[PDB]
Amino acid sequence: GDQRFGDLVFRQLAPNVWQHTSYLDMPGFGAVASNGLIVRDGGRVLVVDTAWTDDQTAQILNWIKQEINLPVALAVVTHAHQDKMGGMDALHAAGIATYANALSNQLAPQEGMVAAQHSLTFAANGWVEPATAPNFGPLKVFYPGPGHTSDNITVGIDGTDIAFGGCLIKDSKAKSLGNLGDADTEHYAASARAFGAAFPKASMIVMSHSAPDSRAAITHTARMADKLR
Numbered sequence: 001g002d003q004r005f006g007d008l009v010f011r012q013l014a015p016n017v018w019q020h021t022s023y024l025d026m027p028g029f030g031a032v033a034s035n036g037l038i039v040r041d042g043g044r045v046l047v048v049d050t051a052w053t054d055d056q057t058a059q060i061l062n063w064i065k066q067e068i069n070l071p072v073a074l075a076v077v078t079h080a081h082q083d084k085m086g087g088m089d090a091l092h093a094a095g096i097a098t099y100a101n102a103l104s105n106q107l108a109p110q111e112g113m114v115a116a117q118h119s120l121t122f123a124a125n126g127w128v129e130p131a132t133a134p135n136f137g138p139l140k141v142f143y144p145g146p147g148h149t150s151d152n153i154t155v156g157i158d159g160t161d162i163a164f165g166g167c168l169i170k171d172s173k174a175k176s177l178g179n180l181g182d183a184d185t186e187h188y189a190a191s192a193r194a195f196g197a198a199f200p201k202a203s204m205i206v207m208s209h210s211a212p213d214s215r216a217a218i219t220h221t222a223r224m225a226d227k228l229r
């Protein structure tokens with residue numbers, strides 16, 4: 001199931017949904033996978049998260065051209081860290097409209113990232129303000145609260161069993177929540193539970209640093225975050 005294309009891996013999760021995976025050495029910790037999503041909506045393609053680098057992100061676009069051969073209408077990126085936004089210039093070079101949380105766009109320069117072209121904002125209960133996410137089709141964007149970072153957002157795919165927790169959610173066997181330097185340890189647990197509650201029909205939880213898991217990833221993440229309060 002893991003289709004290799006250059007240095008990336010693509011895995012079909014549903015008839016119109018694929019996981020993209022790219023790798024970057026984090027010295028002393030290995031070649032770390034980061035996952036995002038590709039969704040076909042009719043005659044166009046939507047991307048969730050870049051790869052770590054421009055070159056890897058251009059490879060995503062080349063895979064899409066070969067395996068889907070439809071235009072990429074937009075991309076949404078889920079926080080201002082390199083695994084999610086490191087390939088912004090490649091998306092812009094391809095003419096793809098890009099979207100991020102307004103706070104991610106604000107943070108991008110200090111994080112060494114190129115900002116997305118458009119900013120998403122969110123209602124008090126986390127759902128995206130629809131005028132800021134035009135043409136998102138089946139992508140349902142939700143801000144669960146601060147957790148892994150203050151800007152982290154999540155995305156469900158309507159018409160599927162899939163929701164994407166990004167780097168907020170760890171798998172059900174993870175030993176910890178990882179680096180907490182940008183994290184909000186007071187609010188993380190509630191944000192993890194809010195993601196679960198936003199997407200109650202998503203039995204397949206996709207996340208950035210582990211393979212797709214059951215909803216036990218959400219409960220385990222929440223329980224780990226409870227430990228930190």
Ligand SMILES: C[C@H](CS)C(=O)N1CCc2ccccc2[C@@H]1C(=O)O
Binds near residue numbers: 026029
């Ligand atoms: C660059 C990304 C942005 S989320 C990052 O910081 N990661 C990625 C996953 C990983 C794996 C091994 C060691 C550290 C990390 C670290 C973390 O989450 O702690």
Ligand SMILES: [Zn+2]
Binds near residue numbers: 079081148149167
């Ligand atoms: Zn991150």
Ligand SMILES: [Zn+2]
Binds near residue numbers: 034081167
């Ligand atoms: Zn990450």
